[PDB]
């Protein structure tokens, strides 16, 4: 009933808060100025990047890309701990848990990256940097084209005005996708997803009662996400080939090989 679905929403929200250092709430406070914290160091060019080494952790495009690579691995780790909190996930066949993460994590990375983004740029290093969109486009190819589709997506997605409590359920729904290639036992995955989808719908009616068919708009975006992921795998396929002075992190190698 309604009560059970509310309890699921809250269990997931609490779990989201623990798993993810920088929430959409903190990120929006930073981006609009309303936090009382020191504003993020702005990285709008080659020099500002250089001066900003002190606030974050061979050639420039490549160094940015390898920074993006470090953060992804951490995201994958955070998303993995979050999954394990989704009721019934750890009782699935372990090979299915792996498959779900393999195909889901980048979809959640782009969903959650939108929390950190406006039309002008993206917070980095847990809100203490802000790397402009023009700077990321200005990078020499193929690195110029890497982040721009994530900005395009974020701009539309941010218009739905979801908060953390909505996003916690949406992300869980994405992870429990019964149509991922190679799943061994779909039915228990779908049973959990059906339950999350009802929890998401109730949440969207309660938390945005003036927004009608937010639930439906939000499901349509789950398909947009698969595109950006496929588009992204192919640019990475290109980068793997056309560049040599850079190795992909082993965890990201696991995820991307034999993927879409």
């Amino acid at each position: 009933e309604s009560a059970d679905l509310r309890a699921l929403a809250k269990h997931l929200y609490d779990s989201y808060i623990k798993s993810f250092p920088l929430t959409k709430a903190k990120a929006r406070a930073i981006l609009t100025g309303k936090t009382t914290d020191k504003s993020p160091f702005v990285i709008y060019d080659m020099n500002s990047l250089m001066m900003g080494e002190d606030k974050i952790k061979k050639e420039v495009a490549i160094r940015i890309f390898q920074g993006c690579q470090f953060r992804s691995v951490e995201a994958v780790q955070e998303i993995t701990e979050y999954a394990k909190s989704i009721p019934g996930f750890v009782n699935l066949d372990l090979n299915d848990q792996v498959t779900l993460l393999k195909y889901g994590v980048h979809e959640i990375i782009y969903t959650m990256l939108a929390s950190l983004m406006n039309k002008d740029g993206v917070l980095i290093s847990e809100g203490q940097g802000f790397m402009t969109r023009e700077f990321l486009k200005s990078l020499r190819k193929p690195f110029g084209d890497f982040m721009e589709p994530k900005f395009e997506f974020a701009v539309k997605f941010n218009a739905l005005e979801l908060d953390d409590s909505d996003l916690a359920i949406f992300i869980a729904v994405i992870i429990l996708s019964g149509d991922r290639p190679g799943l061994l036992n779909v039915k228990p995955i779908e049973d959990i997803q059906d339950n999350l989808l009802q929890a998401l719908e109730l949440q969207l009616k309660l938390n945005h009662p003036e927004s009608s068919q937010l639930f439906a708009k939000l499901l349509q975006k789950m398909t947009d996400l698969r595109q950006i992921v496929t588009e992204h795998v192919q640019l990475l396929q290109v980068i793997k080939k056309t560049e040599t002075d850079m190795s992909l992190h082993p965890l990201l190698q696991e995820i991307y090989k034999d993927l879409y």
Binding site: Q77, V90, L94, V98, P250, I255
Partner: peptide, 11 residues
């Protein structure tokens, strides 16, 4: 295969 993913899950 997926040794790290396995490790992160079994943790």
């Amino acid at each position: 295969r997926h040794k790290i993913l396995h490790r992160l899950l079994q943790e």
